Ligand binder design. Structure first.
Ligand SMILES: [Mg+2]
Ligand SMILES: [Mg+2]
Lengths: 92, 98, 151, 101, 25, 92
């Protein structure tokens, strides 16, 4: 009945996937840029490419170890650059 | 002399779009600013081309007549300026600004 | 009590693979007398309005515009196929209701379709587009992919 | 123009002390660089001492630590301890299996 | 404060003009 | 508590491609505004008079105006100068 007619709006958007954007009728190219940001913050393009071919578990583990090391190495590099900049500012 | 400088300042285009062979892909048509010496060259060549369509055997007479018509408002080179400025307004987004 | 099929919105689906681009335009049809049927529960009514039937109107690929073999998966093939779709939507009087765009994968035609819809080619369709979404299908484990190619 | 973007002007709170440097662009840039979600702890249930596994039937709280698609956030982003991250991830996975998240 | 607020005026104006042009794109 | 990441001893501390800010030319932005002014109010419209006058002065002698068209980063000079002091290496 109408009870099943007036409660479909929330119901429709209650089962959201999180990969949708409400287009800005003024700047429609800014909504496509927002959608792209979601894809990259959920690694959707990377996951899709990584699922095209099978990789042996040993190789998967090696790549995961190396990637983590590079991430941590970059964080250690940036920490040292900040110290350099601070030291330079104070005249060291 | 004041008439000549006024005519050169009104006929010369402020900017002109130039094709830059940037990248293996198609070149980019980016508007570029023009200095006063470059502006005068563009306007003078238009005046000379217009002058050489007149009947006098003497270039001085043809040039004099052309300069008088431009000082009085009538010139066919104002169309050229409007067409150079239209192209630049179209390619305003292609500018780099850094 | 009487079939009252009406269009509620249109779905513009684009599948952008490595070798081709498929663009489908569909209509979300709603029989506006479904609730007037007998022996209909609140659940069946809500379940019918949560997944409304869809009917395909326009189906295009890059080979329908004359692009053959390796050219089908290139940027230019997708841009022209996107234009032909945006034109066929206006030539069929299907630009009255709101359109929802669904993009599927990340091939070279994904960025061509977006450029053709935010540009002159899609200045009529873009005005009706209300929601953009991504429908890329990922697997949580799932079936084994083919072995890596040694090239 | 009588208008400036908010990103180019600093609003000094009321009751606070200021230096002439607080009106410069350096202050604007310095505030962006050192802008961290440090106030989360006081608003972060999982950084308070509660056991995250007690929230397995409360999807609303758990939904604060997943992305828009439901992907559990890395510890680098949540800032939780190893134990709480371990417990929180278990809670979310259990919540997903029950049919609530 | 005036010395600082004068340099800040220039930069604000400059950066409120690069934005306007860059956004025009 | 924020995890500090400490690098191993390194042969160098260097940024591969130091990010240098490059300010925009005042003549190019003046041209970008005038071009927009003509796009709205029309070409040669009396509303863009000031823009035309300013552009002419900016470009009178050099089409891109006189500018400090040079800027280099010194991070690598300081990074190499201070690395041995700040790396926290144990004594020999
Ligand atoms: Mg191919
Ligand atoms: Mg096989």
């Amino acid at each position: 009945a109408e009870i099943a007619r007036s409660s479909v709006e929330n119901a429709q958007m209650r089962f959201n996937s999180g990969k949708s954007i409400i287009v800005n009728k003024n700047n429609p190219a800014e909504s496509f840029k927002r959608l792209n940001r979601i894809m990259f913050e959920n690694n959707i393009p990377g996951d899709k490419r990584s699922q095209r071919f099978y990789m042996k578990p040993g190789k998967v583990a090696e790549l995961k170890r190396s990637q983590r090391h590079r991430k941590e190495f970059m964080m250690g590099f940036k920490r040292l650059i900040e110290i350099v900049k601070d030291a330079k500012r104070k005249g060291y | 002399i004041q008439a000549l400088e006024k005519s050169l300042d009104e006929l010369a285009p402020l900017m002109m779009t130039k094709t830059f062979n940037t990248g293996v892909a198609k070149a980019s048509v980016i508007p570029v600013p023009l200095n006063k010496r470059q502006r005068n060259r563009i306007a003078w060549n238009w005046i000379v081309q217009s002058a050489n369509q007149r009947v006098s055997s003497d270039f001085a007479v043809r040039l004099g007549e052309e300069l008088t018509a431009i000082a009085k408002g009538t010139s066919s080179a104002f169309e050229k300026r409007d067409q150079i400025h239209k192209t630049a307004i179209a390619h305003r987004a292609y500018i780099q600004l850094k | 009590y009487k079939p009252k099929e009406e269009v509620v919105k249109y779905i513009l689906h684009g599948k952008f693979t490595k070798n081709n681009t498929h663009l489908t335009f569909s209509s979300v049809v709603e029989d506006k007398n479904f609730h007037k049927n007998k022996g209909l529960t609140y659940n069946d009514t809500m379940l019918y309005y949560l997944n409304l039937p869809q009917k395909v109107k326009i189906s295009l690929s890059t080979g329908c515009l004359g692009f053959r073999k390796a050219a089908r998966g290139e940027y230019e093939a997708a841009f022209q196929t996107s234009g032909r779709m945006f034109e066929l939507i206006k030539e069929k009087n299907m630009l009255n209701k709101d359109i929802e765009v669904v993009m599927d994968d990340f091939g070279k035609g994904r960025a061509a379709f977006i450029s053709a819809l935010v540009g002159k080619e899609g200045a009529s369709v873009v005005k009706k587009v209300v929601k953009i979404s991504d429908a890329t299908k990922l697997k949580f484990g799932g079936v084994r992919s083919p072995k890596m190619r040694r090239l | 123009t009588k208008k400036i973007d908010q990103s180019l002007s600093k609003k000094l709170p009321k009751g606070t002390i200021y230096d002439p440097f607080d009106f410069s662009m350096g202050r604007i840039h310095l505030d962006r660089k050192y802008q961290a979600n440090k106030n989360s702890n006081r608003n972060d249930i999982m950084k308070s001492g509660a056991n995250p596994l007690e929230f397995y039937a409360r999807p609303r709280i758990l939904s604060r630590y997943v992305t828009s698609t439901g992907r559990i956030q890395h510890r680098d982003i949540t800032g939780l301890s190893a134990k709480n991250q371990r417990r929180l991830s278990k809670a979310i996975r259990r919540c997903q299996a029950i049919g609530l998240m | 404060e005036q010395e600082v607020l004068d340099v800040w005026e220039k930069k604000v104006v400059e950066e409120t003009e690069l934005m306007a042009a860059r956004t025009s794109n | 508590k924020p995890p500090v990441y400490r690098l191993p001893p390194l042969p160098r501390l260097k940024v591969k491609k130091p990010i240098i800010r490059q300010e925009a030319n005042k003549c190019l932005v003046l041209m970008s505004n005038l071009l927009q002014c003509w796009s709205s109010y029309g070409h040669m419209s009396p509303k863009c008079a000031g823009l035309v006058t300013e552009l002419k002065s900016c470009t009178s002698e050099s089409a891109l105006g006189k500018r400090n068209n040079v800027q280099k980063s010194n991070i690598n000079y300081h990074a190499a100068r201070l690395y041995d002091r700040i790396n926290g290496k144990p004594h020999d």
